[PDB]
Ligand binder design. Structure first.
Ligand SMILES: CCN(CC)CCNc1cc(Nc2cc(O)ccc2C)nc(-n2cnc3ccccc32)n1
Length: 269
């Protein structure tokens, strides 16, 4: 059992970082662009003291220690005395959602969109293979590098899977338009419920960050899905890409495809 007062291999001294520019903020803290020991650009997430559990804030970095991959955002360090920091690689173009809604993201042609999709699929194939689930897959939680490599971020909800199902407690609420119906209705999270979110994420990419189910209410979405409705194919969406979405939105979790399969289809598009 680790002592509450002992540090680990990931710890760095606070003075090695110089926080240069605030990239964003929320109720739980801020994200800064920073340099580490002069020559190395990094990203820092700070926790707002009192906004949340310290142990939960830090638990995210523990997960990222385990889930290290080219297509997952890379943990470099932590600072575990208040103010509490998590340090990762810098991803110059920010979130995928904001990128696509920006001028540069808007100029990305279809082949690049499917490139982004394939990179994300690869990362999820790794999460699949490592017996984890993410549970918060969406464009907002993907980051994009200066050379246009997409990587999965936000591992706050990510969990190890024992025996192919995680069961959320009954009072858990999750972003409805992105969450698999069975996960919403009974708390049944599996890698197949991430497969569903990936379908929604595909739609986000091909629509340049447009919200899913535009103009529909959440209860309306839940009832539409039960009835068999699914989002229609956009103008710019190739049939083969929409058919993968549709496979990701099968009613029955076990009939949805594996991430390995999705990666390979998108790879060979
Ligand atoms: C993915 C978006 N969300 C939740 C919606 C997480 C917060 N935004 C972040 C996080 C991040 N790295 C990061 C990711 C984590 O999952 C945990 C800790 C950190 C530091 N880097 C960045 N980040 C890295 N380079 C950037 C350049 C511009 C804007 C943001 C940049 N942003």
């Amino acid at each position: 059992a680790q002592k509450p007062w002992e540090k680990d291999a990931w710890e760095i001294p606070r003075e090695s970082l110089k926080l240069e520019k605030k990239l964003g903020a929320g109720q739980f803290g801020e994200v800064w662009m920073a340099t580490y020991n002069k020559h190395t650009k990094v990203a820092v997430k700070t926790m707002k003291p009192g906004s949340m559990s310290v142990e939960a804030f830090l638990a995210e970095a523990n997960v990222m220690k385990t889930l290290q991959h080219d297509k997952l955002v890379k943990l470099h360090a932590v600072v575990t005395k208040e103010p509490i920091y998590i340090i990762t690689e810098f991803m110059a173009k920010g979130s995928l959602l904001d990128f696509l809604k920006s001028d540069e993201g808007s100029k990305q042609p279809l082949p690049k969109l499917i490139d982004f999709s394939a990179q994300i699929a690869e990362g999820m194939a790794f999460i699949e293979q490592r017996n984890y689930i993410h549970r918060d897959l969406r464009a907002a939680n993907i980051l994009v590098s200066a050379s246009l490599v997409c990587k999965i971020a936000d591992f706050g909800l990510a969990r190890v899977i024992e025996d192919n199902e995680y069961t959320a407690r009954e009072g858990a609420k999750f972003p409805i338009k992105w969450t698999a119906p069975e996960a919403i209705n009974f708390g049944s999270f599996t890698i197949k419920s991430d497969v569903w979110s990936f379908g929604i994420l595909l739609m986000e990419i091909v629509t340049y960050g447009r919200i899913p189910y535009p103009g529909m209410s959440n209860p309306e979405v839940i009832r539409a899905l039960e009835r068999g409705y699914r989002m229609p194919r956009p103008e710019n969406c190739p049939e083969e890409l929409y058919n993968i979405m549709m496979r990701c939105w099968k009613n029955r979790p076990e009939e949805r495809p594996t991430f390995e399969y999705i990666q390979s289809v998108l790879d060979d598009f």
